[model samples]
Target: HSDLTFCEIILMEMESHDAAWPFLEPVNPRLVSGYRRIIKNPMDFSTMRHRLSRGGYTSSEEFAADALLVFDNCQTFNEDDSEVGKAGHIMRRFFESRWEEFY
Candidate 1:
């Protein structure tokens, strides 16, 4: 199976979602203090794109880990009632469904 192709398409779908706005890029450490410290592993759509293009992931599990990591980091960094956190919830749900549908 073409894992890379599946990953690319999944990333494109995630990027297309409106809730993906906050997760498009890495969280600005300057703006959000302690973010870098708190988030040991930062994940974003753009980074995922780069990873796929550069052949970083070996399997769907590797790709999926980063996908979920984005939302997990968001939830940890922002309040649950906050916009980013809410968006993370939505996007995570979308990702899960798409993952099940495809994989």
Candidate 2:
């Protein structure tokens, strides 16, 4: 959405949450593990991914790459705040922000 990777797109959106930026913890395997919570909807993975593809994903790798990006971008965060530095934080926040639809 930002001419950048999905990972980069998340970084840009975190700006409005400057308060949490300074406190978010860095993204690490363990930290990422801690944020692995998901809603129990029957249509979660394949179903949602299918929708993303229809939105212009062309390939599953596109979405996979974004998942990697989310992990990598976590390190760029403050790594101190549990509120925004976690793995799901970026994705969760984006879904609630103004740019949620475009993503």
Candidate 3:
């Protein structure tokens, strides 16, 4: 989905249980712990809904940064292709450009 927003992507990942992949390994205990901390807290669904609703209409650089963080913690199923890594790079550049616009 080319039109999918950052918040939508996050929601999809969370709903699909894919978000937990980063925490599956023993070496990544910290990542697991971090995710656990967030999930354990009651989600402010109203806030999340509002964010998602407005996400596509607003700047997505911050949301891209968040996606990249998730990608970094997860194991890539295909090291050769590494789509996630590519996405991270693109998102990083986008965020950088967005940041540059302000100063």
- TM-scores for the candidates: 0.93, 0.30, 0.28
lDDT of 1 at 54: 88
Task: Indicate whether candidate 2 or candidate 3 has the larger lDDT.
Answer: 2
RMSD of 2: 10.5
lDDT of 1 at 65: 93
Report lDDT per candidate.
0.89, 0.42, 0.41
Q: How many backbone clashes does candidate 3 have?
A: 0
- Candidate 2's C-alpha runs over 4 A off are 1-54, 87-103
- Whole-structure CA lDDT of model 2: 0.42
Q: Candidate 2: worst 10 consecutive residues by lDDT?
A: 38-47
| lDDT minimum window of 10 residues, candidate 1 | 1-10
Off by over 4 Å in 3: 1-6, 17-58, 75-103
Expressed as tens digits, the lDDT of each residue in 1-103 for candidate 1 is 5877788888998999999999898888999889988999999999999888888889989999999899888888899899888999999999999999887
Cα lDDT for residue 95, candidate 2: 35
